[PDB]
């Protein structure tokens, strides 16, 4: 398997990891599902462990995580299609409401231009294609 | 009576004979039980074909709907807005959502065809011959009359018998046909032993169930056979030695295997707590009490913990009213710890109820438990008064602001702080450096929950006095070392030289390993929250640590305490000579060719601390 | 499931716990009667 | 910038969560696919109409010695006659006394009453009024599923107020001098129910962290209210038609050693329901967004509170003087004190929604079914009778809450007069079904009747739909119809106190209080005079 | 017949000390002593009780819910399960549960004196019947023996 997406999955594992000892408990999963808007309880966290709990340690190990992503799930290529609704790389001031709708964070009303204006190259009033290769 | 014989036998009774004649009473009673057998195998045939259609149908269903859903989530993904949540459900709820709306896809014709067959002979004649008997022949013998109308009602409601058939059937493979049989051979031995050594055949019977590969794989099956109630009514029959325990150990394993099993075992808690016949300890009977079944019934699930109510906890403290002499009282408070906490954070409802019933009868404690600390020629009191404290630490209102921004969680916290003094430092610091490890951690988890940094220095000379200096003394001392790595974490939240004396003793103790790194995790943030003259003095031992660094115990102490010394070098914003060797001996490791990529970034803060602050023995 | 009924069918793919038997002999293996039942001629 | 890189992690932190969650799709075990398929097939697809088969079957057993049906009832009586200090399960009984109970426009309205009375003749000819009267007296106080099945038979026999069956229930009790029946009926209501809120907020917190709840409705309302409704309905059917030998049998119970005053014992029950819903008001009183479980715990509690008033009436309805006197000395008055106090405060907050009309109708109806009772308690008054004297005495002891409901009816009746005045109709429109809010704030104000406080309460929601106006027909149909039937009984009850009991002065406070009501219904109530069975004359 | 609001009442037990029926009543002084004590009545034919400092006037009776919302910022009839604000009839101060510790066996017996501060749940006493016959929610008649439970300390009037 291509180790680019596996290194991306290691980055995603460390994104999920908070105690940093190689094992992921249930509480990291509960906090990451509560931080992205959703409201889980202990029952959903518990049996969602028990499905993945083939290793039988109550935690998420790394290679079973890797094949669990390799089951269904590029990463930023599928993410760039969220940016590119229009297909020309432009993410306009009008198109920015169509990108940030399905995230979870309440977008601001003045700082949203400062996110563009610091990142924009010449000031075309949009977010172009060139703000993806050398911005991420 | 295989295929040739039943044609001889049915067409002896059918032709359409035996049934047409006139018969006396206690023979047609015998025929009625015979006639029930034919309908029973008719029911058996209906289930054997309803599992036959099922395997072919889900082979059409799963190979369609799992496969065609895979086409949608590659053509639409957007992790889970709407169309995921229709297929994001429980697997039980997914089954009802898939098929069970068809009484308002492409296979909607096929299952609708089957119910037409399972609409539905001899149903005509049994409904006829029960009428023909009961009309002309005015009946005594109510054992017969009860037997007649059952076969009438079972005939007219053949659906309702099948309604109580499907929550007993179960489907498995050809792999399981080995271990299932001698399971059933053992289970039938227990059902046969229900009516009566009598003990040893049950113990031989129960353990052979407990070593089966098909005993964990299908706990729905073991629930559907009702074999929790089987062993329980055996134990119900025994109660008013080892025959009680060896079935009781099976129940504790029975609830541990799944949550949905444990809900079914909840409904027997009323009888089960009425057994103070076992609480005189004598281990290893402490894995087999009827209390211990009551333990594992509530043990984890917070849903189960909220459902139980006040007469359950009334009887337990009624037994604690009996303890006015003892040793049995430690196990009741062991049970109530599983009634209030259950996850790591307490419940808010049962925690209120138990302490209100713990004031209506009360039973200095540290004035009394100190006097028995040298009692010899005993410990069952020393764990008891440790247990009652360990209970009361669990029913704390909140470490969250529910304690802060609310009344009615303080009213009860006022009770907890009033019944005890501070007091416990009898057991916390003083006696606990000699029994040792079980009770000092128990007194911590009370004091942390109920009751800033002035008592940080006041409650020093604690823990690492005997323990962190005796790393080669290893055996109860060795059993205490990994225990207080995690207990000493929550003390994250002048005498700092003595703290550095224990920390260097902790550094020698850090010279299990996941928890030893956990006590390092409470140590690495400890110097960050340090007047910094001790933090500058602790960095002098860090150069003493740097001499013994440039193994893995110092390698985690190299890159961490270097940036932490820069966090101690915020005070500059004397011993830089040893710091010059500290960059030199690190450069002496740099020319030698692990986690050394961490310590290499710690070298630039060693010049930035000199750019901010300085501008085996 | 259907004839185009007869409860004397021979398929019977349920579990159906098996028969075992023992012959009432007079060997000195006295912890082997001990299992099932005395045998009998069936058919 | 930094928030641009902050969404890249929260994209992958959230997209991995979907691969954690969507990985179960019935994939690898073919056993768990098929084992779960059956249980879902059961609870969805068996469950159909077989229920043509009852009325053919009891027809098939009432055929030409002794009938086949006649032995079946004879089995259950002789089973229920032996002392075992307990009943059984007897799943034969649980199905046959169900099937025996499942088998029960003027000319059709009499012919349906005709063929029903034939179908209860099919059963009570053969002692079916005795297995219901014995299986209650067998189980001493236990509310098991057995005794809940007999009440569904005894209701489906007495269903029309049957007179011969009500004669056979008594004349069986008189000769078999049965203590064990009235000992059993008092113990049956003794626990029986109450809506408890400590089980609700336990579940409400369990609605917090117990995410999906399948059948957690068990301890919620009254512990199987369907039995508790069916107890009192069986008691009401024992007295409809005014069996004055039986309403006096439920009181003093003459020819026995000990006596069970069952009529006080049902007063003590609904007082426990009065407090049970007052506490379900007080907890609720500040949230003001009734969720789904808040609705279906009132609706399962209103109907039982509705039912207990309907059987409270039938002990009083025929003017048995020893029965209404013996309930006036009891603690009835505290219940109707409390029930008023729920009526005002809820209606001011339940009539602020478009979703909370479904609770409003039921709570309006129980107000009517309350005053239908204390109309019927009043009917033996003479002029200044004591039972008329005490009924006004509770009317000042909760005087402060009679105000709001009488004020509530005026808001929706004075709207019902101002419907065809053209400063109500042709003011803002010609006529369309759209008026205004802003002119409705002043077209109503140019009728000069109401204070400004009542105009804003009338301006509660009134459309919540895109217009900042209201609707003509829908608002007035909710104004006229649900408060003119219930409001009529309150007008009758206020009439009935003054004309029967004059020469009170604080009653003249209440009369001139609701003068807008009594001058609206006075073209609808007739006051005739008869010679009502006491050889006196009473207004009707 | 029914105890109501604003009627002078007294509170007395009848405890026996070696078969001597001491019909002691609760009294207090104030104006220099913020504590309560006992007054004896059994030797009434020789020593009469100083009844100026024994009598208490009920001032209010609330449901518990009404109390909890009231702290959050005509003669009525007294009911069980209600919190009452007892008033000393002479000294004007209200009976309360002081948060101090004196004149006890020194385990958790809090002190009962009489203070001035009307607010706070220290001066509210709930009434619980010593009878399974008469129950919660109904009116308390003359001579009904009962329990007084504090709202703040939740300790009985021992
Ligand atoms: Ca982790
Ligand atoms: Ca793991
Ligand atoms: Ca554009
Ligand atoms: Ca650009």
Residues A66 and A78 in one domain: no
Residues A93 and A126 in one domain: yes
Contact residues of D toward A, CB < 8 A: 1, 3-5, 7-17, 19-24, 208-211
Q: How far is CA B382 from the centre of its chain?
A: 28
Q: Residue E52 is encoded by which pair of tokens?
A: 């100026």
* Residue A46 labelled as part of a binding site: no
CB of B322 closer than 8 Å to CB of D217: no
Dmax of chain B from CA atoms? 120
Cα(A13) to centroid(ligand 1), Å? 10
Residues A34 and A86 in one domain: no
Structural domain including A35 reads 2-73
Domain boundary among A39, A58, A73: A73
CB of D131 closer than 8 Å to CB of D76: yes
Q: Which of A18, A30, A47, A77 to mutate to test the interface with B (most CBs of B within 10 A)?
A: A47
Q: C41 to chain B, minimum CA–CA distance in Å?
A: 14
Distance CA D297, CA D280 (A): 9
Contacts 24+ apart (CB under 8 A), B584-592: B585/B546, B585/B547, B585/B549, B585/B550, B586/B546, B586/B550, B588/B550, B589/B550
Q: Do chain A and chain D touch with ≥3 beta carbon pairs under 8 Å?
A: yes
Q: E57 to chain D, minimum CA–CA distance in Å?
A: 23
Domain boundary among A30, A46, A73: A73
CB of D138 closer than 8 Å to CB of D189: no
- Of E79, E153, E156, E89, which is closest to residue E123 (Cα–Cα)? E153
Angle CA D367–D371–D374, to nearest 5? 145
Q: B360 in contact with E at a CB cutoff of 8 Å?
A: no
Q: Which helix (H) or strand (E) holds D98?
A: helix D91-102
CB of B603 closer than 8 Å to CB of B586: yes
Torsion from C-alpha of E109, E115, E120, E126, nearest 10 degrees: 60
E55 Cβ neighbours under 8 A, 6+ residues apart: E8, E9, E10, E89, E90
* Residue A113 labelled as part of a binding site: no
Closest ligand to C-alpha of residue A68 is 2
Strands E83-88 and E15-16: unpaired
Distance CA A65, CA D226 (A): 51
Q: D13 to chain E, minimum CA–CA distance in Å?
A: 43
CB of B235 closer than 8 Å to CB of B190: no
Report chain B residues whose CB lies below 8 A from the CB of A72: 73
* Residue A134 labelled as part of a binding site: no
Distance CA D169, CA D238 (A): 9
* Pairs across A and B, CB distance < 8 A: 13
Enumerate residues with CB within 5 Å of ligand 2 (an ion). A 55, 57, 59, 61
**Phi, psi of C22, rounded to the nearest 5 degrees:** -140, 145
Distance CA D75, CA B99 (A): 44
Residues A90 and A32 in one domain: no
Q: Residue D371 is encoded by which pair of tokens?
A: 């005053």
Burial of D532 (0-12, 13-18, 19+ CB in 10 A): middle
Residues A56 and A80 in one domain: no
E52 conformational bin, left if phi > 0, alpha if psi -120 to 50, beta if neither: alpha
Distance CA A117, CA A136 (A): 16
Q: Which helix (H) or strand (E) holds E21?
A: strand E21-22
* Residue A50 labelled as part of a binding site: no
D284 Cβ neighbours under 8 A, 6+ residues apart: D290, D294
Residues A105 and A44 in one domain: no
- Three-state SS at E4: strand
- Three-state SS at B27: helix
Closest ligand to C-alpha of residue A87 is 3
Report chain D residues whose CB lies below 8 A from the CB of B157: 50, 95
Interchain CB distance below 8 Å, D331 and E138? yes
CB of D192 closer than 8 Å to CB of D228: yes
Report chain B residues whose CB lies below 8 A from the CB of E108: 362, 418-419
Distance CA A102, CA E99 (A): 56
Q: E72 in contact with B at a CB cutoff of 8 Å?
A: no
Q: How many CB atoms sit inside 10 A of residue B369's CB? A: 20
Closest ligand to C-alpha of residue A135 is 4
**What was the elucidation method?**
cryo-EM
* Residue A44 labelled as part of a binding site: no
Residues A48 and A7 in one domain: yes
Report chain B residues whose CB lies below 8 A from the CB of C1: 45-46, 49-50, 52-53, 117-118
Q: Which of D9, D17, D18, D203 to mutate to test the interface with A (most CBs of A within 10 A)?
A: D17
The string of DSSP letters for D154-209 reads: HHHHSTT--HHHHHHHHHHHHHTT-STTHHHHHHHTTSS--B-SHHHHHHHHHHHH
Chains that touch E (3 or more CB pairs under 8 A): B, D
Torsion from C-alpha of D419, D422, D424, D425, nearest 10 degrees: 80
Integer-rounded Cα radius of gyration of chain E = 16
Distance from the first to the final alpha carbon of chain B: 92
Torsion from C-alpha of B452, B458, B461, B462, nearest 10 degrees: -40
C-contacting residues in B 198-217 (Cβ below 8 Å): none
Residues A101 and A127 in one domain: yes
Residue with tokens 């009938």: D67
Contact residues of E toward D, CB < 8 A: 63, 65, 137-138
Q: D354 to chain A, minimum CA–CA distance in Å?
A: 28
CB of D346 closer than 8 Å to CB of D281: yes
**Phi, psi of B405, rounded to the nearest 5 degrees:** -90, 50
Residues A110 and A56 in one domain: no
State which residue of chain A sits closest to B345, comparing Cα positions.
Answer: A42
Residue with tokens 């020593």: E47
- Of E130, E128, E123, E118, which is closest to residue E150 (Cα–Cα)? E123
Q: Do chain C and chain A touch with ≥3 beta carbon pairs under 8 Å?
A: no
Burial of B548 (0-12, 13-18, 19+ CB in 10 A): middle
Distance CA D368, CA D365 (A): 5
Residues A69 and A91 in one domain: no
Distance CA B195, CA B181 (A): 22
Distance CA B170, CA B172 (A): 7
Enumerate residues with CB within 5 Å of ligand 4 (an ion). A 120-121, 124, 128
The string of DSSP letters for B471-510 reads: TT---HHHHHHTTHHHHTTGGG--THHHHHHHHHHHHHHT
> Strands, E, within B94-238: which ranges?
none
Residues A124 and A67 in one domain: no
* Residue A57 labelled as part of a binding site: yes
Burial of D523 (0-12, 13-18, 19+ CB in 10 A): exposed
Chains that touch C (3 or more CB pairs under 8 A): B
* Residue A47 labelled as part of a binding site: no
- Three-state SS at D39: helix
Cα(A119) to centroid(ligand 4), Å? 8
Distance CA B491, CA B526 (A): 9
Report chain A residues whose CB lies below 8 A from the CB of B260: none
C-alpha dist (Å) from residue D500 to D328, D381, D388, D507: 18, 7, 8, 12
Residue B241, beta-bridge partner list: none
* Residue A64 labelled as part of a binding site: yes
Residues A105 and A127 in one domain: yes
- Of D102, D147, D93, which is closest to residue D120 (Cα–Cα)? D102
B27 Cβ neighbours under 8 A, 6+ residues apart: none
Q: A4 in contact with D at a CB cutoff of 8 Å?
A: no
Q: Which of B73, B78, B512 to mutate to test the interface with A (most CBs of A within 10 A)?
A: B78
E87 Cβ neighbours under 8 A, 6+ residues apart: E56, E57, E58, E59, E93, E94, E95
Three-class SS string for D392-455? HHHHHHCHHHHHHHHHHHHHHHHHHHCCCCCCCCCCCCCCCCECCCCCHHHHCHHHCCCCHHHH
Cα-Cα-Cα-Cα dihedral sign, residues E76, E81, E82, E86? positive
Closest ligand to C-alpha of residue A96 is 3
CATH number of residue A58's parent domain: 1.10.238.10
- Of B259, B266, B236, B263, which is closest to residue B248 (Cα–Cα)? B236
Residues E1-13: b if buried by 16+ CB within 10 A, e if exposed: eebbbeeeeebbe
Distance CA B570, CA B530 (A): 11
Residue with tokens 């019933």: B357
Q: B254 to chain A, minimum CA–CA distance in Å?
A: 18
Nearest by CB to B302, which of A42, A72, A82?
A: A42
- Of D388, D400, D364, which is closest to residue D510 (Cα–Cα)? D400
- Asked if omega into B118 is within 30° of 0 (cis), the reply is no
C42 conformational bin, left if phi > 0, alpha if psi -120 to 50, beta if neither: alpha
Report chain C residues whose CB lies below 8 A from the CB of B49: 1
Q: Residue B518 is encoded by which pair of tokens?
A: 């956990």
B497 Cβ neighbours under 8 A, 6+ residues apart: B534, B537
C-alpha dist (Å) from residue D107 to B488, D104, D111, D112, D114: 88, 19, 6, 8, 10
**Phi, psi of C7, rounded to the nearest 5 degrees:** -80, 5
Contact residues of C toward B, CB < 8 A: 1-2, 5-15, 17-18
Resolution in A: 3.9
Q: Residue B452 is encoded by which pair of tokens?
A: 């800033």
Domain count, chain A: 2
Torsion from C-alpha of D261, D265, D267, D271, nearest 10 degrees: 160
* Residue A53 labelled as part of a binding site: yes
Q: Give the number of residues written for chain D.
A: 540
State which residue of chain B sits closest to A23, comparing Cα positions.
Answer: B514
Interchain CB distance below 8 Å, B45 and C2? no
Distance CA D372, CA B448 (A): 62
- Breaks in chain D after (C-N > 2.5 angstroms): 64, 104
- Three-state SS at C38: strand
Distance CA D95, CA B154 (A): 10
Dmax of chain D from CA atoms? 99
* Residue A108 labelled as part of a binding site: no
Q: C40 to chain B, minimum CA–CA distance in Å?
A: 16
Q: A79 to chain B, minimum CA–CA distance in Å?
A: 9
Residues E99-122: b if buried by 16+ CB within 10 A, e if exposed: eeeeeeeeeeebbbbbbeeeeebb
Angle CA B120–B121–B123, to nearest 5? 70
- Three-state SS at E114: strand
Burial of A66 (0-12, 13-18, 19+ CB in 10 A): middle
C-alpha dist (Å) from residue E90 to D456, E30, E41, E50, E83: 50, 9, 19, 12, 22
Q: How far is CA B138 from the centre of its chain?
A: 61
Residue E114, beta-bridge partner list: E95
Closest ligand to C-alpha of residue A59 is 2
Q: Residue B33 is encoded by which pair of tokens?
A: 């039980």
CB of C43 closer than 8 Å to CB of B212: no
Burial of D354 (0-12, 13-18, 19+ CB in 10 A): exposed
B-contacting residues in E 113-142 (Cβ below 8 Å): none
CB of D247 closer than 8 Å to CB of D318: yes
State which residue of chain D sits closest to E76, comparing Cα positions.
Answer: D397
Distance CA B177, CA B183 (A): 10
Domain boundary among A73, A90, A121: A73
Distance CA A7, CA D12 (A): 13
């Amino acid at each position: 398997l291509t180790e680019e997406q596996i290194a991306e999955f290691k980055e995603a594992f460390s994104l999920f990891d908070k105690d940093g000892d190689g094992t992921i408990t249930t509480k990291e999963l509960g906090t990451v599902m509560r931080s992205l808007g959703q409201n889980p309880t202990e029952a959903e966290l518990q049996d969602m462990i028990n499905e993945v709990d083939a290793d039988g340690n109550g935690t998420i190990d790394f290679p079973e995580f890797l094949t669990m992503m390799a089951r269904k799930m590029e990463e930023i290529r599928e993410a760039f299609r969220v940016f590119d609704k229009d297909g020309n790389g432009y993410i306009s001031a009008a198109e920015l409401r169509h990108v940030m709708t399905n995230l979870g964070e309440k977008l601001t009303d003045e700082e949203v231009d400062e996110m563009i204006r610091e990142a924009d190259i010449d000031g075309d009033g949009q977010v172009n294609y060139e703000e993806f290769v050398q911005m991420m | 009576f295989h295929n040739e014989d039943l044609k001889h036998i049915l067409q002896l009774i059918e032709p359409s004979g035996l049934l047409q004649m006139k018969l006396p009473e206690p023979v047609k009673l015998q025929m009625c039980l015979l006639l029930q057998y034919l309908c029973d195998c008719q029911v058996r045939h209906r289930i054997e074909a309803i599992v036959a259609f099922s395997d072919d149908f889900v082979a059409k269903l799963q190979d369609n709907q799992r496969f065609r859903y895979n086409e949608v989530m590659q053509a639409l993904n957007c992790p889970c807005p709407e169309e995921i949540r229709d297929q994001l459900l429980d697997f039980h709820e997914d089954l009802m959502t898939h098929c069970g709306i068809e009484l308002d896809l492409t296979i909607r014709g096929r299952l609708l065809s089957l119910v037409e067959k399972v609409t539905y002979t001899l149903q005509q004649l049994i409904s006829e011959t029960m009428v023909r008997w009961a009309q002309e022949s005015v009946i005594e013998d109510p054992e017969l009359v009860r037997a007649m109308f059952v076969l009438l009602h079972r005939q007219y409601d053949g659906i309702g018998g099948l309604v109580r058939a499907l929550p007993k059937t179960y489907t498995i493979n050809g792999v399981s046909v080995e271990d299932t049989i001698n399971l059933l051979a053992s289970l039938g031995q227990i059902r046969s032993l229900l009516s009566v050594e009598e003990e040893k055949l049950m113990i031989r019977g129960l353990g052979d169930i407990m070593n089966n590969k098909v005993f964990y794989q299908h706990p729905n099956l073991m629930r559907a056979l009702g074999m929790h109630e089987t062993v329980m009514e055996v134990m119900v029959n025994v109660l008013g030695p080892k025959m009680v325990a060896n079935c009781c150990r099976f129940l504790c394993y029975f609830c541990r295997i799944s949550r949905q099993n444990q809900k079914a075992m909840f409904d027997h808690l009323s009888y089960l707590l009425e057994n103070s016949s076992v609480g005189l300890a004598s281990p290893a009977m402490r894995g087999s009490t009827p209390l211990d079944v009551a333990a594992a019934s509530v043990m984890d699930n917070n849903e189960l913990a909220l459902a139980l109510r006040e007469p359950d906890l009334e009887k337990v403290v009624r037994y604690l009213a009996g303890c006015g002499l003892p040793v049995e009282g430690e196990r009741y408070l062991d049970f109530l710890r599983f009634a209030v906490f259950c996850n790591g954070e307490s419940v808010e409802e049962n925690a209120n109820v138990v302490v209100r019933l713990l004031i209506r009868r009360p039973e200095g404690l540290l004035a009394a438990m100190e006097e028995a600390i040298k009692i010899a020629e005993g410990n069952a009191i020393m764990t008891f008064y440790a247990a009652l404290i360990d209970l009361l630490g669990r029913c704390a209102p909140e470490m969250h602001l529910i304690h802060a921004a609310k009344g009615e969680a303080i009213r009860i916290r006022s009770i907890l702080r009033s019944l005890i003094p501070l007091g416990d430092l009898v057991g916390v610091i003083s006696i606990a450096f000699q029994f040792c490890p079980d009770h000092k951690a128990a007194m911590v988890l009370f004091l942390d929950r109920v009751y800033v940094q002035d008592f940080l220095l006041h409650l020093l000379e604690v823990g690492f006095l005997p323990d962190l200096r005796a790393a080669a003394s290893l055996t109860d001392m060795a059993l205490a070392l990994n225990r207080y790595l995690c207990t000493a974490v929550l003390p994250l939240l002048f005498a700092g030289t003595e703290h550095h004396a224990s920390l260097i003793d902790s550094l020698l103790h850090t010279v299990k390993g996941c928890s030893l790194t956990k006590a390092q995790r409470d140590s690495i943030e400890v110097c960050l929250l340090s007047r910094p003259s001790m933090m500058q003095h602790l960095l002098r031992r860090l150069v003493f640590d740097v001499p013994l660094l440039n193994k893995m115990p110092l390698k985690l102490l190299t890159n961490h305490y270097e940036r932490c010394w820069k966090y101690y070098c915020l005070p500059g914003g004397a011993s830089e000579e040893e710091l010059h060797l500290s960059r030199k001996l690190f450069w002496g490791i740099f020319d030698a060719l692990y986690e050394q990529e961490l310590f290499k970034l710690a070298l630039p803060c060693l010049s930035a601390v000199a750019g901010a602050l300085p501008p085996n023995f | 499931l259907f004839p185009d009924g007869l409860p004397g069918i021979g398929l019977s793919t349920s579990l159906r716990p098996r028969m075992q038997f023992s012959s009432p002999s007079f060997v000195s293996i006295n912890n082997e009667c001990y299992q099932y039942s005395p045998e009998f001629p069936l058919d | 910038k930094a928030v641009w890189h902050k969404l890249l992690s929260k994209q992958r932190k959230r997209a991995v969560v979907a691969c954690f969650r969507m990985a179960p799709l019935y994939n690898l075990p073919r056993h768990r696919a098929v084992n779960l398929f059956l249980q879902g097939y059961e609870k969805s697809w068996i469950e159909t109409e077989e229920h043509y088969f009852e009325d053919k079957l009891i027809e098939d057993l009432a055929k030409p010695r002794v009938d086949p049906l006649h032995q079946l009832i004879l089995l259950f009586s002789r089973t229920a006659l032996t002392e075992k200090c307990k009943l059984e399960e007897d799943f034969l009984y649980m199905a046959y006394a169900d099937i025996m109970a499942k088998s029960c426009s003027f000319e059709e309205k009499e012919m349906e009453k005709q063929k029903l009375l034939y179908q209860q003749a099919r059963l009570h000819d053969r002692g079916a009024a005795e297995m219901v009267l014995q299986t209650i007296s067998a189980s001493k106080g236990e509310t098991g599923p057995m005794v809940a099945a007999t009440l569904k038979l005894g209701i489906a026999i007495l269903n029309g107020g049957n007179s011969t069956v009500q004669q056979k229930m008594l004349e069986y009790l008189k000769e078999k001098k049965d203590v064990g029946f009235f000992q059993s009926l008092a113990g049956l209501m003794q626990s029986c129910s109450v809506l408890d809120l400590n089980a609700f907020e336990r579940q409400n917190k369990a609605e917090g962290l117990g995410m999906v709840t399948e059948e957690g409705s068990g301890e919620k309302v009254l512990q199987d209210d369907e039995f508790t409704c069916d107890l009192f309905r069986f008691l009401q059917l024992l007295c409809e038609g005014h069996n004055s030998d039986f309403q006096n049998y439920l009181r003093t119970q003459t020819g026995n050693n000990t006596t069970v005053n069952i009529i006080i014992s049902t007063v003590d029950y609904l007082l426990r329901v009065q407090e049970s819903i007052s506490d379900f008001y007080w907890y609720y009183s500040g949230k003001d967004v009734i969720d789904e479980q808040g609705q279906r715990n009132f609706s399962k509690a209103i109907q039982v509170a509705k039912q207990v008033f309907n059987t409270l009436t039938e002990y009083i309805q025929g003017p048995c003087t020893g029965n209404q006197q013996s309930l006036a000395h009891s603690r009835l008055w505290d219940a109707v004190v409390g029930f008023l106090h729920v009526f005002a405060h809820m209606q001011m907050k339940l009539s602020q929604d478009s979703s909370q009309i479904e609770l409003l109708k039921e709570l309006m109806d129980l107000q009517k079914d309350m005053v239908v009772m204390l109309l019927s308690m009043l009917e033996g008054n003479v002029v200044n009778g004591t039972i008329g004297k005490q009924m006004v005495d509770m009317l000042v002891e909760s005087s402060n809450n009679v105000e709001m409901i009488l004020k509530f009816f005026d808001m929706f009746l004075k709207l019902k007069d101002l419907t065809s005045s053209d400063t109500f109709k042709e003011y803002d429109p010609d006529g369309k079904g759209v008026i205004s809010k802003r002119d409705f704030h002043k077209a109503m104000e140019s009728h000069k009747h109401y204070t400004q406080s009542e105009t804003e309460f009338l301006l509660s929601c009134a459309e919540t739909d895109e217009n900042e106006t209201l609707d003509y027909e829908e608002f007035v149909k909710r104004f006229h119809e649900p408060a003119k039937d219930i409001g009529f009984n309150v007008a009758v009850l206020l009439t009935n106190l003054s004309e029967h009991m004059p020469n009170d002065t604080r009653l003249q406070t209440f009369l001139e209080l609701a003068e807008s009501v009594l001058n609206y219904f006075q073209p609808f109530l007739g006051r005739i005079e008869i010679m009502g069975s006491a050889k006196r004359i009473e207004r009707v | 017949q029914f105890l109501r609001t604003d009627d002078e009442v007294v509170l007395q037990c009848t405890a026996t000390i070696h078969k001597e029926q001491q019909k002691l009543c609760l009294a207090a002084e104030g104006f220099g002593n913020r504590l309560c004590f006992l007054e004896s009545t059994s030797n009434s034919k020789n020593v009469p009780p100083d009844l100026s400092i024994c009598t208490f006037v009920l001032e209010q009776s609330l449901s518990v819910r009404a109390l909890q919302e009231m702290l959050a910022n005509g003669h009525r009839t007294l009911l069980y399960g209600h919190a009452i604000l007892l008033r000393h009839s002479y000294s004007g101060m209200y009976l309360c549960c002081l948060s101090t510790s004196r004149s006890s066996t020194d385990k958790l017996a809090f002190d009962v004196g009489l203070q001035e501060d009307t607010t706070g749940e220290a001066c509210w006493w709930t009434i619980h019947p010593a009878s399974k016959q008469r129950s919660e929610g109904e009116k308390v008649r003359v001579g009904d023996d009962l329990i007084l439970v504090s709202v703040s300390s939740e300790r009985y009037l021992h």
